[PDB]
Design an enzyme around this catalytic site. Sequence first.
Site, mmCIF file in Angstrom:
data_model
loop_
_atom_site.group_PDB
_atom_site.id
_atom_site.type_symbol
_atom_site.label_atom_id
_atom_site.label_comp_id
_atom_site.label_asym_id
_atom_site.label_seq_id
_atom_site.Cartn_x
_atom_site.Cartn_y
_atom_site.Cartn_z
ATOM 1 C CG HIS A 42 -0.322 0.715 2.511
ATOM 2 N ND1 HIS A 42 -0.235 -0.246 3.571
ATOM 3 C CD2 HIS A 42 -0.155 1.805 3.091
ATOM 4 C CE1 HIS A 42 0.270 0.482 4.385
ATOM 5 N NE2 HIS A 42 0.288 1.564 4.260
ATOM 6 C CG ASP A 90 -0.242 -3.683 3.072
ATOM 7 O OD1 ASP A 90 0.355 -2.907 2.081
ATOM 8 O OD2 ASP A 90 -0.342 -2.868 3.929
ATOM 9 N N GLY A 189 2.383 6.631 8.785
ATOM 10 C CA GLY A 189 3.774 6.646 8.326
ATOM 11 C C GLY A 189 4.742 5.421 8.926
ATOM 12 C CB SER A 191 2.965 1.574 6.340
ATOM 13 O OG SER A 191 1.650 1.968 6.779
HETATM 14 N N1 LIG Z 1 -2.275 4.856 8.385
HETATM 15 C C1 LIG Z 1 -1.238 4.011 8.824
HETATM 16 C C2 LIG Z 1 -1.548 3.090 10.254
HETATM 17 C C3 LIG Z 1 -0.453 2.244 10.206
HETATM 18 C C4 LIG Z 1 -0.691 1.604 11.566
HETATM 19 C C5 LIG Z 1 -1.676 1.452 12.351
HETATM 20 C C6 LIG Z 1 -1.691 0.882 13.353
HETATM 21 O O1 LIG Z 1 -2.156 1.566 14.095
HETATM 22 C C7 LIG Z 1 -2.467 2.668 12.019
HETATM 23 C C8 LIG Z 1 -2.514 3.322 10.986
#
Ligand SMILES: NCc1ccc(CO)cc1
Length: 239
Positions: A42, A90, A189, A191
């Site tokens: 993603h 993912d 961030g 991810s």
């Molecule tokens: N939008 C990225 C994101 C990554 C990870 C989590 C885990 O809370 C929430 C959101």
Amino acid sequence: IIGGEFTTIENQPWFAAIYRRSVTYVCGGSLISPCWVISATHCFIDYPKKEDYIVYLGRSRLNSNTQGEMKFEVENLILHKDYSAAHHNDIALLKIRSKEGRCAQPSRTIQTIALPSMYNDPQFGTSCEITGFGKEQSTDYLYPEQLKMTVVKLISHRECQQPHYYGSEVTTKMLCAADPQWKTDSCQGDSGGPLVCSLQGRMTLTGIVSWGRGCALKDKPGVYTRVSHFLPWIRSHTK
Ligand SMILES: NCc1ccc(CO)cc1
């Protein structure tokens, strides 16, 4: 990362900082081998061209040049073909090579992380780590300048499968993790980053930050891509 603590690359020598080209931080990643960094699909699905990406290793600061760090081009951008935005499959692979053509040279601020053994994850309730330059706070606009990491606990599928939790949104190819207090977690961030657990006395790349509802919210675990369910994909794609 919400909560947790600051750290340097020495405590996460395998973490990669991925950026893109008109200037800017994209996602975290994990070095599973000299020429391969694993991350989340993603993170690149909107800009699939491997030419607009820069991957650093041995880097602990967001907009500074950690000494000892290495900058690489993305020789290959491999996204999982069965991905679907909650995110399925993912997982992504980036083959790195610098300009002088070289792969990553291991050192004190740069090392590889071992993958799990097929269908083998720590017991539920186990403590693992998560690293990233993600927001420290949901409402924050900026990203932390210093690298961050915290601790979260593995949740059972049955538990995360609940409806007050994520219900069906989560599958067996996913892992949830959270604090018993929901006070620390991964966030925007972070991810593509590593969910590391000690299995059989060995730091293992158990998950890759993928998604979650909000950040550090009650009954809203951070969801990760269960790596021990993707080895054939990983192996064949790094052949
Ligand atoms: N939008 C990225 C994101 C990554 C990870 C989590 C885990 O809370 C929430 C959101």
